[PDB]
């Protein structure tokens with residue numbers, strides 16, 4: 116099966132937000148609103164903001180999962196490639212097979228679904244720090260889009276779901292991801308292709 120990617124704000128008005136990082140050659144993570152696409156370097160911090168219009172209950176959680184974007188590949192589990200799953204870059208918590216990690220959150224939990232075999236990472240939903248308007252999760256993507264035997268140049272989506280304590284759906288948002296060596300140049304190139 117294929118997890119839903121339908122945008123759903125739900126009762127709490129859940130949606131993502133992204134910083135405005137620009138497209139300089141040196142940028143390590145940059146988001147294109149026109150493409151709804153995040154471009155990032157391998158294993159580098161990707162800040163993703165969480166926004167709600169009203170406060171969700173204690174025990175609400177936030178899950179991230181990757182799927183292939185193209186219909187002919189969406190049934191295949193997105194995982195790290197045969198090299199990266201063996202490179203012993205573990206953070207002590209993420210299984211080495213998982214593409215998506217959460218950085219710097221000791222409460223992150225990693226799921227291998229017993230039925231679909233898909234990977235996901237889930238954290239408690241926390242309120243913004245005093246003085247802030249939103250909460251930020253720091254994600255890492257642990258393979259390049261081009262990795263042979265893994266993503267192998269196939270585009271992926273990240274689906275972020277807001278869930279209750281049982282795992283029921285409260286909200287959903289999503290964005291395409293390209294993990295690449297030069298996110299700034301690739302964002303500029305793909306945005307110009309879209310314009311042309």
Ligand SMILES: CCn1c2ccc(C[NH2+]C)cc2c2ccc(-c3cnoc3)cc21
Pocket residue numbers: 165166167168169170171172173174175240241242243247248249250
């Ligand atoms: C999704 C993260 N988030 C927000 C993001 C933006 C804004 C709006 N600021 C102007 C408010 C919240 C907010 C309020 C409460 C909680 C909460 C309580 N208990 O668990 C989670 C989580 C919250």
Ligand SMILES: [Zn+2]
Pocket residue numbers: 195196197198199200257258259262263265
């Ligand atoms: Zn890889």
